Amino acid sequence: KTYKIGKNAGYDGCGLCLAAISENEAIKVKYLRDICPDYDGDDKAEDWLRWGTDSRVKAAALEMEQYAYTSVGMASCWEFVEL
Amino acid sequence: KTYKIGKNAGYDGCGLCLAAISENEAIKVKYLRDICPDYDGDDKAEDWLRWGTDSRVKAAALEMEQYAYTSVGMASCWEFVEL
């Protein structure tokens, strides 16, 4: 599933990210490379097997989930794809 | 075919663009949205059917072609893909 990333959502190019989704749009994104500065992968979906249970990723997701449906995925050309 | 975009090549994120290619690298990119400010598409490959014969696009391409192999394509995630 694919969702447009708005212009005030924190977009910063391609990368694995969390997204908050509301009314068919990703209204906030948070990149794995910012949540976890020690992340050194090449943005492969399989990287979430390693990083998805990181306490920093869990904390970032819980903060967004208070307010909107949240999921792990990948950002590319202003679109968020759910993984 | 896909080429890494160089660091001083004019990269500005995602979008339809012309690229000059040298030694398996895109050493200059010029975005359609900058060449033609009236372009208002969603960076679909088919958009080049409308815009590829615009006189501003032909002029930008010929300028680069003087010095390097040039093609129309799409820039995303620091790579250029030929169309």
Author numbering:
A (entry chain B), B (entry chain A): 3 to 85
Quote the paper.
Anti-CRISPRs (Acrs) are natural inhibitors of bacteria’s CRISPR-Cas systems, and have been developed as a safeguard to reduce the off-target effects of CRISPR gene-editing technology. Structural studies show that AcrIIC1 can directly bind to the conserved HNH nuclease domain of Cas9 to abolish its DNA cleavage activity. Among the different Acr proteins characterized so far, AcrIIC1, a broad-spectrum inhibitor against diverse type II-C Cas9 orthologs, is one of the most promising engineering candidates to target the desired Cas98,14.
Fortunately, we managed to grow protein crystals formed by the oxidized NmeAcrIIC1 and solve the crystal structure of the dimer with a resolution of 1.61 Å by using X-ray crystallography. In the dimeric structure, one of the protomers is rotated roughly 180 degrees relative to the other partner, which then allows for the dimerization via two intermolecular disulfide bonds. Strikingly, the two subunits assemble mainly through two parallel intermolecular disulfide bonds formed by Cys17 and Cys80, but not hydrophobic or electrostatic interaction that is commonly observed in mediating protein–protein interaction. Each subunit of the dimeric form aligns with the reduced monomeric form of NmeAcrIIC1 with a small RMSD of 0.68 and 0.73 Å, respectively. Second, by examining the electron density map of the oxidized NmeAcrIIC1, we observed that both of the intermolecular disulfide bonds are not fully occupied, indicative of dynamic short-lived chemical groups. Second, the estimated rotational correlation time (Τc) for the oxidized dimer is almost twice as that for the reduced monomer (11.6 versus 6.0 ns), whereas the trends of 15N backbone relaxation data of R1, R2, and Het-NOE align well between the two states on a residue-by-residue base, which reveals a rigid dimer with restricted orientation for each subunit but lacking large interfacial surface that is supposed to alter the dynamic properties of the residues involved. Together, the CSD and 15N relaxation data for both forms of NmeAcrIIC1 in solution strongly support the crystal structure, stating that the crystal structure of the oxidized dimer can reliably represent the dimer’s behavior in solution. Importantly, compared with the structure of NmeAcrIIC1’s complex with NmeHNH, the counterpart subunit of dimeric NmeAcrIIC1 occupies the position of the NmeHNH, burying the “hot spot” residue Ser79, thereby inhibiting the interaction between NmeAcrIIC1 with NmeHNH through steric hindrance. Thus, the dimeric structure rationalizes how oxidization and dimerization of NmeAcrIIC1 result in the disruption of NmeHNH binding and the loss of inhibitory activity against Cas9.
